[PDB]
Design a protein around this nucleic acid. Structure first.
Ligand code: MG
Lengths: 222, 222
DNA sequence: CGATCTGGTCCGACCAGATG
DNA sequence: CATCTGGTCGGACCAGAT
């Protein structure tokens, strides 16, 4: 696909300093011809990339190429994963860590402000296929569920940005049985902790599951 | 601006259930004419909104309208702020909260993994204009700085998605002198803690500044 | 040889900021 | 005001989906 091709081409070039961050993108009129698509297409592509933080469009001035690390949002996680294959592993570990540490914040909060709701999400733990694809979504829906269940939606949005790569990684991890089991427990355990009002035992819990689930996923990759 | 007008109009409609989430967007051909712009423009806008997660475009099928809460990332913060004026206040408190609670995670980490770097960011604390606009950026650069300084870039990206509204809020808060002072302290204090390897006192600290800096912003608004 | 609704891409002309 | 750059027109033509 033209647009598809176009976007990859630009992103590609920006990635491996062909269109270095800090520089200027070739005028739309030449860039399009140079790419092999019509302005119209390029145009739509520049508008999309612009929204992901890759570029800075300003009527009448060359379009600036940015350092994503400076203007790109959690939405480029899947991309920064397809560009640097050798990094992926680490990148994942970082993603998972962020989830763990961050979730403790809102999980512990959700159990405090709206336990009634937090229990409703942890409820979805039951009635669920024993298939990877299924879990992945549930699991995600659980963490994203609890995040909103904190009353501070922003965590929810944060979770939204992580969906993309999180799930993919899940679809692979939850293929393993030993993994599906750990989660269920982690879930049931949380729900217990929420009911028993053991709010002060959440961190220790969440912290482990991360570590444990982490170790499994580690063996699955090695 | 056409594109400008168009986007607002669509986002506007999606906001106050004119184009309810879960429904279908009028065909591009009629929607354009209905808005007052040419398909070419509308098209660019649909591609933009599409990336922010507002729509789901699939060649050949109607464009689905989404529940942003489900697919939008931290980048709609500035938007969810312009749409719901009455919520802004709360919306900000939430943002700041997120900042505080999340930051201890990476600030504490950064002090462990790369003190050397974390000290280089806290260094910018000095040599800085005593003007709001200035600080705002410094302050943001400092937290974003420490985020990357933790080795887990993901926090950095998270901070990126927050830049928008965070700064705007800053530009208003840092106009107050009493605010500018509190930060400096928080910065210097952070740098000491880092130097002294007081790795276990950070939470207590960061937590306060938030509370204290929060109280000031509170009085500034009331 | 289905008919039709909907998106994707292409042209080439013109409007309109930014800046020498 | 010249020209570089992006922004908007419209109204032809290709292509997936039911
Ligand atoms: Mg030239």
């Amino acid at each position: 696909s033209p647009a598809g091709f176009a976007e990859e081409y630009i992103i590609e070039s920006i990635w491996n300093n062909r269109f270095p961050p800090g520089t200027i993108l070739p005028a739309e009129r030449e860039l399009s011809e140079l790419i092999g698509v019509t302005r119209t297409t390029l145009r739509e592509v520049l508008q999309r990339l612009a929204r992901d933080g890759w570029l800075t469009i300003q009527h009448g001035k060359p379009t600036k190429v940015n350092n994503f690390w400076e203007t790109s949002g959690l939405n480029i996680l899947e991309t920064l994963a397809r560009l640097d294959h050798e990094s992926v592993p680490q990148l994942i570990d970082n993603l998972l860590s962020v989830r763990t540490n961050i979730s403790t914040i809102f999980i512990r909060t959700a159990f405090r402000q709206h336990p009634d709701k937090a229990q409703e999400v942890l409820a979805t733990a039951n009635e669920v296929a024993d298939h990877a694809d299924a879990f992945a979504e549930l699991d995600y829906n659980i963490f994203r569920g609890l995040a909103f269940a904190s009353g501070n939606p922003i965590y929810g949005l944060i979770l939204n940005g992580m969906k993309g790569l999180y799930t993919r990684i899940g679809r692979h991890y939850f293929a393993n049985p030993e993994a599906r089991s750990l989660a269920l427990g982690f879930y049931h355990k949380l729900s217990a902790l929420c009911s028993e009002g053991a709010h002060d035992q959440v961190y220790e819990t969440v912290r482990r599951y991360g570590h444990e689930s982490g170790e499994i996923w580690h063996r699955m990759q090695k």
